[PDB]
Amino acid sequence: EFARPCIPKSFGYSSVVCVCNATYCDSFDPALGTFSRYESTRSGRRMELSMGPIQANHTGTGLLLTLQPEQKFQKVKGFGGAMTDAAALNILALSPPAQNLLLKSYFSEEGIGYNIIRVPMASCDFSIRTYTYADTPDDFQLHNFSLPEEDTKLKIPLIHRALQLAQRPVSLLASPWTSPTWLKTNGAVNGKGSLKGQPGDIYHQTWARYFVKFLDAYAEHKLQFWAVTAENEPSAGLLSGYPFQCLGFTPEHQRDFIARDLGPTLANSTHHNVRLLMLDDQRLLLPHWAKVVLTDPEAAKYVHGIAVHWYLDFLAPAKATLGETHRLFPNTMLFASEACVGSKFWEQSVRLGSWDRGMQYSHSIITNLLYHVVGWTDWNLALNPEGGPNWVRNFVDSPIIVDITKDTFYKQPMFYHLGHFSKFIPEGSQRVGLVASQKNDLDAVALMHPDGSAVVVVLNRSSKDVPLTIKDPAVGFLETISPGYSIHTYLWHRQ
Ligand SMILES: *[C@@H]1O[C@H](CO)[C@@H](O[C@@H]2O[C@H](CO)[C@@H](O[C@@H]3O[C@H](CO)[C@@H](O)[C@H](O)[C@@H]3O)[C@H](O)[C@H]2NC(C)=O)[C@H](O[C@@H]2O[C@@H](C)[C@@H](O)[C@@H](O)[C@@H]2O)[C@H]1NC(C)=O
Numbered sequence: 001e002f003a004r005p006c007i008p009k010s011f012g013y014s015s016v017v018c019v020c021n022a023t024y025c026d027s028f029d030p031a032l033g034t035f036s037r038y039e040s041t042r043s044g045r046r047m048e049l050s051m052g053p054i055q056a057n058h059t060g061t062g063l064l065l066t067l068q069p070e071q072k073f074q075k076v077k078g079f080g081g082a083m084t085d086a087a088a089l090n091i092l093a094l095s096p097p098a099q100n101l102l103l104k105s106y107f108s109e110e111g112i113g114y115n116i117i118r119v120p121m122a123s124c125d126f127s128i129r130t131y132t133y134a135d136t137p138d139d140f141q142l143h144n145f146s147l148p149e150e151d152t153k154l155k156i157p158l159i160h161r162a163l164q165l166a167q168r169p170v171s172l173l174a175s176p177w178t179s180p181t182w183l184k185t186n187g188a189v190n191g192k193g194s195l196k197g198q199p200g201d202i203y204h205q206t207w208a209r210y211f212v213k214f215l216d217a218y219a220e221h222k223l224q225f226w227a228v229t230a231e232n233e234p235s236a237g238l239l240s241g242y243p244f245q246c247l248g249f250t251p252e253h254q255r256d257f258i259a260r261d262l263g264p265t266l267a268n269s270t271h272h273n274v275r276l277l278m279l280d281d282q283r284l285l286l287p288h289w290a291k292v293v294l295t296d297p298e299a300a301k302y303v304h305g306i307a308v309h310w311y312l313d314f315l316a317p318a319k320a321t322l323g324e325t326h327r328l329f330p331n332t333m334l335f336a337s338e339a340c341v342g343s344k345f346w347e348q349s350v351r352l353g354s355w356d357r358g359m360q361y362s363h364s365i366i367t368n369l370l371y372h373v374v375g376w377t378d379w380n381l382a383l384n385p386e387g388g389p390n391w392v393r394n395f396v397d398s399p400i401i402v403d404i405t406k407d408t409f410y411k412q413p414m415f416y417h418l419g420h421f422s423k424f425i426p427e428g429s430q431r432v433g434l435v436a437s438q439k440n441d442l443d444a445v446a447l448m449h450p451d452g453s454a455v456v457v458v459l460n461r462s463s464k465d466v467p468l469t470i471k472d473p474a475v476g477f478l479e480t481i482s483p484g485y486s487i488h489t490y491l492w493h494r495q
């Protein structure tokens with residue numbers, strides 16, 4: 001519609017947030033052989049558009065990044081975030097006009113064109129109430145399964161509004177944290193405990209049927225799922241005292257649950273097209289978890305992909321984990337399903353305007369893309385200034401922070417860093433080769449849109465400006481510069 005600049009505000013951190021309210025939010029409005037550049041900087045530029053010429057020749061010894069359009073890697077599924085109870089409550093705390101600008105920021109082409117929404121199956125830490133959908137004890141046939149108001153009045157109507165705003169088809173992803181407690185060895189939503197008994201038994205068939213019941217219930221409200229994960233962070237339920245909703249699975253337990261219960265139960269339902277993602281956990285668990293599950297032909301036939309979380313990335317070099325998994329199982333897509341900053345005990349939950357947190361998002365996304373990952377999903381879409389609500393006070397940060405007392409929301413550097421990918425990398429884009437002429441400190445990734453046009457994202461996490469050239473053998477050269485602490489997305493038609 002109308003380009004509207006960022007209203008910047010400092011809270012004493014490395015960069016600014018962009019301030020939006022009931023009546024204002026920043027928003028957005030290429031001939032060959034010109035390119036488009038979108039730039040965001042620590043100094044305060046927010047996805048600003050500029051253009052350049054593509055030259056026929058280049059001479060120099062500076063950094064050159066050469067597109068290898070014939071070297072084809074993964075297709076992109078997409079980008080988005082999570083509609084938790086906390087996110088829904090924060091969004092709905094705004095006046096309806098401000099709610100609409102927040103939703104448009106994320107889901108509109110006038111915003112950043114999210115096409116993924118992760119939906120918890122009942123309560124997680126980012127809930128104010130602890131509940132499942134089948135809390136009546138020993139209800140093995142699930143006669144009393146139902147969605148409560150957290151879904152029917154809060155999450156579902158918000159998801160519908162997001163879908164209405166989006167011009168791209170939106171894919172929903174569901175993940176459970178805990179089963180009903182009466183299905184669990186420890187009889188509690190949290191702590192160390194798994195499903196009682198063994199895969200193939202009444203407890204496991206009931207838990208498998210719960211997934212179908214969830215999907216049935218959402219489909220009654222006219223929402224269809226792209227995928228479900230087999231459990232959020234199954235490793236969590238293996239840990240003594242784990243503080244909030246979880247459900248423990250070893251990789252063998254998960255393998256046999258998928259083979260015997262979950263896979264066949266979904267396959268025999270009207271939801272047989274919904275994809276099943278395994279793991280949904282820290283990538284250090286790869287490739288071991290992939291080997292355990294995927295080398296059993298009975299489990300493998302049901303698994304579409306492997307979902308990863310980013311929290312222990314420091315213990316898990318991408319080559320040894322993502323790269324090795326891809327090498328062994330290249331037909332089982334890798335998908336980043338949850339990330340947030342501010343979650344470590346020593347970290348401040350919310351740092352309004354943190355450029356570092358921004359760069360953390362984009363560095364992870366680029367690294368993921370360079371190691372075959374097909375999409376990347378943020379955690380809570382919005383939180384309050386404390387990084388909540390959260391029933392166990394496990395507060396964290398969010399690209400959007402809602403200030404209820406001011407009917408205001410703040411878009412953080414994380415929002416724009418994610419936007420440098422989500423806005424410009426449609427579903428069906430394919431990552432292609434990009435080689436550097438010399439060692440450098442930049443993170444860079446090249447992809448091709450479904451129509452054959454090019455997209456390159458370049459992140460400079462250093463304080464030093466790096467002039468550089470991008471070579472496309474089809475079109476020519478783009479002479480540019482990557483300022484210290486910047487992120488650029490470059491777009492051009494190749495035909
Ligand atoms: C919602 O957010 C928008 C953008 O921040 C607010 O509109 C803007 O309000 C500013 C007032 O703080 C306007 O600026 C002033 O300009 C004069 C010169 O013409 C200066 O002398 C002065 O120092 C200010 O800088 C600003 O122009 C305005 N609009 C835009 C599009 O930038 C909005 O504030 C509300 O609306 C405006 C138009 C005024 O009526 C304000 O009094 C009013 O608070 C924010 N909404 C709310 C309710 O906070």
Ligand SMILES: CCCCN1C[C@H](O)[C@@H](O)[C@H](O)[C@H]1CO
Pocket residue numbers: 124125126232233311312338343394396
């Ligand atoms: C190892 C750190 C995991 C971080 N958590 C993952 C879990 O899925 C979410 O429910 C949490 O909110 C998140 C942050 O503590």
